[PDB]
Amino acid sequence: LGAPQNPNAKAAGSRKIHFNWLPPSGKPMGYRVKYWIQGDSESEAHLLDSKVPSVELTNLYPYCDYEMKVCAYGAQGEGPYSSLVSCRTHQEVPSEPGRLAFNVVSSTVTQLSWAEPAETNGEITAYEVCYGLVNDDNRPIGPMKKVLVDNPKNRMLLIENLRESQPYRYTVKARNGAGWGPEREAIINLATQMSIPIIP
Amino acid sequence: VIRIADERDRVQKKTFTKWVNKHLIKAQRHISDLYEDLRDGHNLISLLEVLSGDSLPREKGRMRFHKLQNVQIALDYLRHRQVKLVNIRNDDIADGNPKLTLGLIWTIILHFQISDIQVSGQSEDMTAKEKLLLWSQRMVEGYQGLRCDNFTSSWRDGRLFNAIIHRHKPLLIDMNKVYRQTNLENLDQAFSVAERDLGVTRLLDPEDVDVPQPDEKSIITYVSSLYDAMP
Numbered sequence: 001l002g003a004p005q006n007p008n009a010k011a012a013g014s015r016k017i018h019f020n021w022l023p024p025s026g027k028p029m030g031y032r033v034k035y036w037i038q039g040d041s042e043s044e045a046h047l048l049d050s051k052v053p054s055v056e057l058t059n060l061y062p063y064c065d066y067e068m069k070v071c072a073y074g075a076q077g078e079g080p081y082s083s084l085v086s087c088r089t090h091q092e093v094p095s096e097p098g099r100l101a102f103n104v105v106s107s108t109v110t111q112l113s114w115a116e117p118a119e120t121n122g123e124i125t126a127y128e129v130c131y132g133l134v135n136d137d138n139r140p141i142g143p144m145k146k147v148l149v150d151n152p153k154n155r156m157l158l159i160e161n162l163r164e165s166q167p168y169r170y171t172v173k174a175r176n177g178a179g180w181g182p183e184r185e186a187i188i189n190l191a192t193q194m195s196i197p198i199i200p
Numbered sequence: 201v202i203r204i205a206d207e208r209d210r211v212q213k214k215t216f217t218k219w220v221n222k223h224l225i226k227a228q229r230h231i232s233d234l235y236e237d238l239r240d241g242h243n244l245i246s247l248l249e250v251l252s253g254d255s256l257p258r259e260k261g262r263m264r265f266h267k268l269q270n271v272q273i274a275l276d277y278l279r280h281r282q283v284k285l286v287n288i289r290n291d292d293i294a295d296g297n298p299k300l301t302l303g304l305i306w307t308i309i310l311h312f313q314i315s316d317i318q319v320s321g322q323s324e325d326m327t328a329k330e331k332l333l334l335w336s337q338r339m340v341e342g343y344q345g346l347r348c349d350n351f352t353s354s355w356r357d358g359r360l361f362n363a364i365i366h367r368h369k370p371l372l373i374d375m376n377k378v379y380r381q382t383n384l385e386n387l388d389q390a391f392s393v394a395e396r397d398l399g400v401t402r403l404l405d406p407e408d409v410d411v412p413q414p415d416e417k418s419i420i421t422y423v424s425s426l427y428d429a430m431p
């Protein structure tokens with residue numbers, strides 16, 4: 001058997017890749033797909049069997065580049081591998097931004113800052129910060145102010161004009177190609193707590 | 201009501217970056233964004249290797265598990281060197297929390313550059329900072345009208361910077377003209393001279409110092425590096 005020709009891959013939905021090829025001349029019993037993450041050795045590769053000239057790679061990482069090749073087998077054993085084909089998976093909404101850190105500037109001013117989500121699952125393009133008054137049981141008493149940060153590299157926010165000795169709830173969430181992820185939360189009273197960050 | 205991150209954090213970030221690069225180039229390394237180029241841990245490790253001359257392990261990986269491992273190496277090195285790193289976790293640096301990252305670098309600067317200050321008639325109850333201020337005051341003593349009360353407003357007009365360099369090498373500075381020049385002119389002159397004649401890296405831009413309230417940590421880092429360039 002020769003090598004399967006015309007290796008062809010494309011992202012298909014969540015965490016999976018559709019991979020097909022042109023069968024080699026003859027009557028192959030099946031194929032063996034070898035796939036791995038671009039940058040990893042063909043030693044961390046996974047091996048899939050198929051009886052048909054296509055395969056679904058599942059359980060993959062979001063927004064991740066994958067390399068793959070395929071070989072055919074039959075009566076006379078395994079044949080050569082196809083040429084390499086590279087393909088990137090679709091994106092997923094990000095995880096929570098990192099825990100929130102507060103630099104108290106005054107009884108009415110604070111510098112909120114957060115880390116990038118541990119799993120971006122894509123290219124992060126914005127952050128949204130909500131903050132608002134909460135009562136004694138720590139639930140908002142009114143509409144939360146919403147702030148769009150259109151520069152994802154800016155993970156710091158100077159919020160001034162807050163009320164003295166008043167508890168405020170703060171949330172940060174990230175957005176990427178797939179949309180918005182879950183929120184990271186913290187309740188902070190400025191009066192309660194110099195230039196060293198606080199972290200609930 | 202929200203506003204733009206404080207200008208002082210912009211300047212502190214630039215100061216800390218120029219400082220980190222000053223050392224990293226010794227190892228043929230260079231960071232571009234302080235809030236990104238330290239997340240994988242490799243640069244922190246290299247920075248520490250250069251600063252202490254020690255040799256540190258490296259978990260060579262590609263994923264997050266390995267980032268965290270590498271950063272932990274850096275943090276552990278500091279903690280074993282009795283450097284208190286409070287409220288700072290490895291994932292905080294690996295995931296790039298900007299304030300905490302700033303803090304880590306400040307800590308590093310304190311421990312390696314600012315803490316080894318030595319002034320005549322000092323006390324071990326004096327902080328590294330208090331010793332640096334004492335030093336500055338001793339250097340500009342006698343210079344008419346010159347006075348060093350803090351590491352912020354006191355440096356705004358550039359005159360202390362010039363006087364300090366003058367005390368060390370009178371031939372480099374024309375104090376007469378310093379008394380007649382603008383804050384910017386003086387600042388620039390000082391930074392320029394210190395760089396070309398004392399090999400003191402230009403951590404600060406004049407426009408970033410000529411302000412009502414300069415970034416204290418940035419001033420401190422620079423003043424400390426003047427001290428380093430002097431016996």
